[PDB]
Amino acid sequence: TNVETVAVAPTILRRGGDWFASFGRERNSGTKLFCISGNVNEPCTVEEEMSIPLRELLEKHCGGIKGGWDNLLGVIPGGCSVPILPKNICEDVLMDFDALKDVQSGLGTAAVIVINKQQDVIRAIQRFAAFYKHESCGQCTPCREGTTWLLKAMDRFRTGQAKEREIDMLYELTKDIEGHTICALGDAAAWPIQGLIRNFRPEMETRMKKFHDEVGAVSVGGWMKDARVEKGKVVGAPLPGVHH
Amino acid sequence: MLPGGPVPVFKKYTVGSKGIWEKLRVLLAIAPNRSTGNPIVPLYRVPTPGSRPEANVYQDPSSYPTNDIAENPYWKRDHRRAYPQTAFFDQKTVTGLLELGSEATPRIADGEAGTKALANIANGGVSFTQALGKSSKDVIYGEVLTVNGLPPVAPTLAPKQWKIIEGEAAIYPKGYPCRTFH
Amino acid sequence: KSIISYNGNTIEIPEEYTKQAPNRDSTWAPAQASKTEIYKNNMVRFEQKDLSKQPMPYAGIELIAQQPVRFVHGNTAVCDGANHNGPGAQGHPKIFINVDAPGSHACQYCGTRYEKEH
Numbered sequence: 001t002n003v004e005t006v007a008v009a010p011t012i013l014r015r016g017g018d019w020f021a022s023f024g025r026e027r028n029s030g031t032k033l034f035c036i037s038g039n040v041n042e043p044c045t046v047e048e049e050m051s052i053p054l055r056e057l058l059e060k061h062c063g064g065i066k067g068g069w070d071n072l073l074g075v076i077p078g079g080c081s082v083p084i085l086p087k088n089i090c091e092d093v094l095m096d097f098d099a100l101k102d103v104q105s106g107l108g109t110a111a112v113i114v115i116n117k118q119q120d121v122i123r124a125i126q127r128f129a130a131f132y133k134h135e136s137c138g139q140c141t142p143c144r145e146g147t148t149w150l151l152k153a154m155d156r157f158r159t160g161q162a163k164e165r166e167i168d169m170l171y172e173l174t175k176d177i178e179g180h181t182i183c184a185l186g187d188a189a190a191w192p193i194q195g196l197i198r199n200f201r202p203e204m205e206t207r208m209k210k211f212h213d214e215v216g217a218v219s220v221g222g223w224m225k226d227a228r229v230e231k232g233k234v235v236g237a238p239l240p241g242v243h244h
Numbered sequence: 245m246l247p248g249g250p251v252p253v254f255k256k257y258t259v260g261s262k263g264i265w266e267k268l269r270v271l272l273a274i275a276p277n278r279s280t281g282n283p284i285v286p287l288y289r290v291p292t293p294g295s296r297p298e299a300n301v302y303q304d305p306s307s308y309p310t311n312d313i314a315e316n317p318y319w320k321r322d323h324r325r326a327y328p329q330t331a332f333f334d335q336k337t338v339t340g341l342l343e344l345g346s347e348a349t350p351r352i353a354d355g356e357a358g359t360k361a362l363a364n365i366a367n368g369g370v371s372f373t374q375a376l377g378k379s380s381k382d383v384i385y386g387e388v389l390t391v392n393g394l395p396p397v398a399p400t401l402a403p404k405q406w407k408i409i410e411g412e413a414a415i416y417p418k419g420y421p422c423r424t425f426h
Numbered sequence: 427k428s429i430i431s432y433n434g435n436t437i438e439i440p441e442e443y444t445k446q447a448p449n450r451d452s453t454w455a456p457a458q459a460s461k462t463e464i465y466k467n468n469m470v471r472f473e474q475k476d477l478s479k480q481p482m483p484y485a486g487i488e489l490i491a492q493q494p495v496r497f498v499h500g501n502t503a504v505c506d507g508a509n510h511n512g513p514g515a516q517g518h519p520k521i522f523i524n525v526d527a528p529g530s531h532a533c534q535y536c537g538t539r540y541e542k543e544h
């Protein structure tokens with residue numbers, strides 16, 4: 001059990017259950033501790049009732065969004081293991097399990113990560129990919145190999161060293177992990193890339209056009225015309241993400 | 245002309261004559277149309293096969309729905325493993341189709357009754373000749389013979405209806421003992 | 427060199443032709459037969475023949491040891507024996523060689539060796 005799930009319990013037994021059910025919608029009862037972080041004006045941990053609207057949590061218990069509401073790009077309402085939400089949804093969405101599942105997302109650990117328009121959302125998602133690569137236990141095949149593959153692809157989509165059909169390829173890669181695992185870390189590694197591809201695809205296409213214009217053409221896998229194996233290394237093109 | 249000849253010499257990629265010798269050749273030829281089959285050396289097999297420029301740009305050819313990288317699972321195009329089975333019909337299985345019916349035209353009872361009705365044919369209960377004698381007119385004339393009562397012909401996958409070409413578009417003239425079939 | 431035959435007699439062969447290759451005297455595998463064993467067992471078919479003109483190619487075990495070590499910045503070295511001067515593949519399959527260990531490490535198709543910059 002979670003710390004919160006047991007810590008509250010004495011108060012629910014003392015104060016009487018129906019009290020705890022007095023909050024939230026029918027099947028989403030209770031209070032909930034929300035940590036709001038990122039590009040919000042005053043990052044905070046608060047305790048509000050369930051099914052609170054997201055706009056209300058951000059504006060009344062935090063400083064609102066840094067630069068105004070319409071300077072919002074997206075909100076991740078349940079931590080890294082949940083797909084991002086675009087601005088169109090966050091205006092009238094309630095912070096619950098049911099609604100957030102109704103918009104193809106989830107209420108996870110009630111951690112709201114806010115992103116501005118000045119930020120690179122692709123960098124956020126590729127950092128979550130790197131996180132799930134570093135944190136894979138290394139047991140079962142799809143997470144083992146696919147977190148690495150997803151990071152390798154997202155490192156390239158950050159710089160635009162890819163093609164437009166490789167986005168659909170990446171979606172299929174996430175589906176190669178999303179149910180063929182022992183634990184749910186593979187699903188948590190598949191879901192954010194799905195959210196990005198669902199809501200922020202033209203940004204990716206724009207980055208790839210920028211690369212095609214500023215550097216040169218590209219093939220499947222990030223290869224260029226001049227890219228060759230010369231003396232133990234690939235020399236004729238950039239290699240994203242390699243730091244060792 | 246016709247679509248298939250004759251054609252002049254200067255449209256044939258063969259080495260001929262020049263000058264007075266062409267004026268003589270077209271005088272002394274059974275058919276001046278005809279060519280001396282020496283290939284033109286500047287044009288025939290030049291550039292050589294081992295010095296073609298197209299080798300440096302040649303890449304492996306493909307087709308779209310099979311080369312696609314996203315919506316192309318192999319099991320949707322695994323035609324080898326979707327091979328058609330060989331159907332086998334002994335006399336038991338055909339009297340079942342006759343005594344009872346088919347999945348297209350059922351004539352079988354419901355529940356366990358039809359089940360052991362089938363089982364009576366799976367074992368030697370009713371024979372094929374018995375089922376043919378017991379078969380109505382509307383069974384035979386429509387499921388053994390045709391609706392008109394006639395037997396079915398040896399089927400043809402791709403029927404070919406022949407046409408004879410005569411006269412000027414034929415290969416040989418009228419006198420010769422070989423004809424032309426389209 | 428004079429090689430003693432199985433019937434007790436001698437088989438005189440010059441030193442140039444007892445070498446396994448012109449660039450190596452010895453064998454490079456256990457089951458490989460020495461030239462002395464070859465002559466000792468087949469001299470009836472070598473007798474009036476010219477050893478000058480038989481095939482005696484150079485051994486690659488000694489030519490690949492002359493090729494210097496390549497150096498890389500990382501744990502992996504990628505090898506593809508491509509020509510880079512004519513079209514097509516023309517090499518061996520692409521192989522990734524781990525080089526974290528102290529020494530040098532060779533490809534399995536070619537014997538090109540790699541080290542971790544130390």
Ligand SMILES: Cc1cc2nc3c(=O)[nH]c(=O)nc-3n(C[C@@H](O)[C@@H](O)[C@H](O)COP(=O)(O)O)c2cc1C
Pocket residue numbers: 001002003005183184185
């Ligand atoms: C990769 C992964 C990480 C998880 N991390 C946590 C965590 O850090 N803290 C936590 O209390 N639950 C975490 N969970 C949830 C479950 O492991 C477990 O805690 C369970 O959901 C608790 O049941 P409960 O919500 O009723 O208390 C995680 C699940 C996965 C797959």
Ligand code: SF4
Pocket residue numbers: 135136137138139140141143144181182183184185186
């Ligand atoms: S999916 Fe879970 S069990 Fe499988 S390798 Fe990743 S962390 Fe380990």
Ligand SMILES: [Zn+2]
Pocket residue numbers: 505506507518521533534535536537538
């Ligand atoms: Zn090699």
